[PDB]
């Protein structure tokens, strides 16, 4: 319980990387968050908008 200052710095860096990785699964308004779905389902003109 005394070393909470060092564990807090580890926890903040871990939460920042876990937030960065979870945001890969977000759609942002595209057809899928999986870039390979878009490229396997759509042609150049329609894919590039997604």
């Amino acid at each position: 319980s005394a070393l909470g200052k060092l564990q807090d710095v580890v926890n903040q860096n871990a939460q920042a990387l876990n937030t960065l990785v979870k945001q890969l699964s977000s759609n942002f308004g595209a057809i899928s968050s999986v870039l390979n779905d878009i490229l396997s389902r759509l042609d150049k003109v329609e894919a590039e908008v997604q």
């Binding site: 057809i31 396997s40 389902r41 759509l42 042609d43 329609e46």
Partner: protein, 49 residues
Amino acid sequence: VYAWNRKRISNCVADYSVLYNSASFSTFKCYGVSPTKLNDLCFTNVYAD
């Protein structure tokens, strides 16, 4: 159209170019997919309404 027929399609292989290469069709709009890619895909179910 008030009582449309849903023909379920499953457990089979489909060449969609048999459809989209035919001049018999007046329109062939697709949403979320392109006709060119349909021969590269697979689906859990297909419903022909």
